[PDB]
Amino acid sequence: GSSGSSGMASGQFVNKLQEEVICPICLDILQKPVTIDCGHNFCLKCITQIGETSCGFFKCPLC
> Minimum CB separation from Zn ion for residue 22, in Å?
9
Any contact of residue 44 with Zn ion (CB under 5 A)?
no
Asked if 23 interacts with Zn ion (CB under 5 A), we say yes
- Count other C-beta atoms under 10 Å from residue 38's C-beta: 14
Please, which residue, 1 or 39, has the CB nearer to Zn ion? 39
25 vs 33, which CB is nearer to Zn ion? 25
SS3 label, residue 45: helix
Which distant-in-sequence residues (6+ apart) come within 8 Å of 33 by Cβ?
21, 41, 42, 43
**Using rule CB under 5 A, residue 46 touches Zn ion:** yes
